[PDB]
Amino acid sequence: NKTVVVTTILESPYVMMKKNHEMLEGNERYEGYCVDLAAEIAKHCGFKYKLTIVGDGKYGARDADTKIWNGMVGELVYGKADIAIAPLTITLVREEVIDFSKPFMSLGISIMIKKGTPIESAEDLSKQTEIAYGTLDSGSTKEFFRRSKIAVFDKMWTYMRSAEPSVFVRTTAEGVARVRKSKGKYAYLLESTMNEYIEQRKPCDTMKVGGNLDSKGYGIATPKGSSLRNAVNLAVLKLNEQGLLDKLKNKWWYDKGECG
Amino acid sequence: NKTVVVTTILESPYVMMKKNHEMLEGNERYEGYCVDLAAEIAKHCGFKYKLTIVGDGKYGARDADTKIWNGMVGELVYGKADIAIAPLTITLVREEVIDFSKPFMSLGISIMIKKGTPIESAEDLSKQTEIAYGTLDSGSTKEFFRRSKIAVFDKMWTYMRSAEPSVFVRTTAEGVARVRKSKGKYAYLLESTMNEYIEQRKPCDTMKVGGNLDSKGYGIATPKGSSLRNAVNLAVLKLNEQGLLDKLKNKWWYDKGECG
Numbered sequence: 001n002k003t004v005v006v007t008t009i010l011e012s013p014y015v016m017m018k019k020n021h022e023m024l025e026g027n028e029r030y031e032g033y034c035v036d037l038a039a040e041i042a043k044h045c046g047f048k049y050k051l052t053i054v055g056d057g058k059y060g061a062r063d064a065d066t067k068i069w070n071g072m073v074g075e076l077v078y079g080k081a082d083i084a085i086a087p088l089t090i091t092l093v094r095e096e097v098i099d100f101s102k103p104f105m106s107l108g109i110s111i112m113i114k115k116g117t118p119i120e121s122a123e124d125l126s127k128q129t130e131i132a133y134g135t136l137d138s139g140s141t142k143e144f145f146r147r148s149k150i151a152v153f154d155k156m157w158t159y160m161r162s163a164e165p166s167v168f169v170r171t172t173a174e175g176v177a178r179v180r181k182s183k184g185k186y187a188y189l190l191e192s193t194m195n196e197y198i199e200q201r202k203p204c205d206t207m208k209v210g211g212n213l214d215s216k217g218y219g220i221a222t223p224k225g226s227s228l229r230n231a232v233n234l235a236v237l238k239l240n241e242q243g244l245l246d247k248l249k250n251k252w253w254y255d256k257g258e259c260g
Numbered sequence: 261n262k263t264v265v266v267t268t269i270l271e272s273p274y275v276m277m278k279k280n281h282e283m284l285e286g287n288e289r290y291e292g293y294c295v296d297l298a299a300e301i302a303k304h305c306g307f308k309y310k311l312t313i314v315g316d317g318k319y320g321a322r323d324a325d326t327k328i329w330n331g332m333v334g335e336l337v338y339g340k341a342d343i344a345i346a347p348l349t350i351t352l353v354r355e356e357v358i359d360f361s362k363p364f365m366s367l368g369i370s371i372m373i374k375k376g377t378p379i380e381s382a383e384d385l386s387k388q389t390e391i392a393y394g395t396l397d398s399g400s401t402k403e404f405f406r407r408s409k410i411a412v413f414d415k416m417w418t419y420m421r422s423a424e425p426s427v428f429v430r431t432t433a434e435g436v437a438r439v440r441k442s443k444g445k446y447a448y449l450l451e452s453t454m455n456e457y458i459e460q461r462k463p464c465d466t467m468k469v470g471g472n473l474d475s476k477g478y479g480i481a482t483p484k485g486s487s488l489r490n491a492v493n494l495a496v497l498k499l500n501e502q503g504l505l506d507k508l509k510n511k512w513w514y515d516k517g518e519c520g
């Protein structure tokens with residue numbers, strides 16, 4: 001009936017521009033895990049769709065003062081998109097305003113270091129000051145630290161919120177580049193999925209250290225009242241049970257892996 | 261207003277009879293992860309509740325011929341219970357007939373061996389005959405194998421469905437006992453959570469081997485149209501984000517683990 005507007009975000013390897021994208025049009029410009037997922041979800045739910053990259057390049061957070069949502073969440077809330085198919089973390093504040101499918105991928109917050117950085121844990125980071133560390137802006141990881149009552153994470157947040165120069169970054173790519181150029185003096189807090197991906201990318205100079213700080217998942221999000229909610233939810237479960245989600249993770253993370 | 265009837269299942273360490281249960285009343289008769297979780301869900305959602313143990317001791321399957329649901333799923337479907345708070349796996353066939361919250365615990369199907377069994381993977385099991393293997397006789401693990409189109413799992417199902425005497429077991433405890441008494445000649449396919457629990461129980465003679473075969477979760481289930489659906493879902497998210505779910509796992513799996 002109507003073309004479904006999918007909001008997504010340029011985040012490797014979920015959605016990336018193809019090497020030859022400039023000569024391509026519409027959905028064909030993009031590739032990645034979420035591009036593949038979107039095609040599968042659309043197939044099983046029987047809709048046509050248009051992939052649109054989120055205008056402000058953000059996942060989604062609510063301004064404390066205006067109460068206005070930004071990012072992909074904002075696009076859903078304000079009716080600019082019909083569905084978000086992205087590595088969008090299922091969170092309480094978000095699930096209060098949009099609906100999430102069952103998770104299509106699990107993750108937890110993790111630590112990325114430049115190889116050789118003498119840091120093994122969140123506790124290690126919190127104890128010292130020589131190595132700076134931060135998170136992505138307008139995402140679920142920043143909110144995790146902001147809200148945490150756990151002493152280690154509370155101390156980390158107290159440090160991060162005030163740190164000069166700013167330890168927060170606008171994009172995951174910015175966080176990763178920062179780790180890579182900072183000679184071991186910057187650690188980055190990011191989701192395990194993204195961390196593991198980057199660990200298998202040239203120049204193979206980063207690694208994930210320590211356990212995950214939490215356990216959660218990404219979900220496909222729809223605005224409240226969406227006619228797509230049930231079908232999308234069931235389609236995620238179908239794709240999981242077919243082993244398709246695992247196949248896609250292997251395709252985008254490890255099959256193309258550059259670090260041996 | 262009205263006391264919420266909770267269906268659950270006697271499965272360690274989720275729900276267990278307290279040693280002194282005969283001298284206790286109602287909800288106080290039980291202990292475990294899901295007992296603790298039920299109390300917290302009820303507090304956060306503002307309802308009074310009565311724990312009940314599923315009459316038939318099953319999780320929930322639909323009979324192929326009668327189309328009747330058994331187990332906890334049936335208790336929800338047929339209106340015998342208002343909510344299931346148990347290690348109940350989120351599956352497509354169940355989500356078609358009941359609602360699940362977001363997952364409160366992650367798990368995958370996994371392999372339990374008697375220590376020293378020369379099995380490292382599902383592939384290993386599928387390629388040999390000396391070591392028998394089976395699943396819980398009703399549940400999502402059996403269904404995974406029944407429905408699988410992946411070669412290794414198909415081969416396994418082909419073996420399991422035809423094996424005489426039956427490789428299937430009535431309860432997890434029966435599966436574990438069978439591994440323990442079979443001198444390495446039986447391996448049990450069960451959820452990683454249950455596997456990890458038993459690995460920390462005396463006599464410390466079993467272990468999880470290989471990676472998980474899939475990735476899913478347990479959810480709190482409510483019948484369709486339940487007024488509890490949203491509150492329960494948000495309560496799971498709140499409890500995850502506040503670290504309670506991880507605390508409860510540690511409490512019931514590891515804090516009093518018997519294997520060092």
Ligand SMILES: Cc1cc(C(F)(F)F)nn1CC(=O)Nc1sc2c(c1C(N)=O)CCCC2
Nearest residue numbers: 090102103216217350363365366476477500
């Ligand atoms: C990969 C997969 C598919 C399925 C499903 F299909 F069964 F739903 N579950 N999972 C595992 C998963 O994502 N776990 C999740 S997501 C999530 C939480 C947990 C958890 N703590 O276990 C806690 C609240 C925030 C959102």
Ligand SMILES: N[C@@H](CCC(=O)O)C(=O)O
Nearest residue numbers: 059087088089139140141
């Ligand atoms: N997946 C996160 C963004 C990345 C992060 O915060 O680490 C979100 O949905 O906000």
Ligand SMILES: N[C@@H](CCC(=O)O)C(=O)O
Nearest residue numbers: 319347348349399400401
């Ligand atoms: N958690 C499973 C039962 C255990 C199993 O099948 O391994 C279910 O909900 O069916």
Ligand SMILES: [Zn+2]
Nearest residue numbers: 040043044244
């Ligand atoms: Zn498909």
Ligand SMILES: [Zn+2]
Nearest residue numbers: 063064065066
């Ligand atoms: Zn503002």
Ligand SMILES: [Zn+2]
Nearest residue numbers: 300303304504
């Ligand atoms: Zn509480």
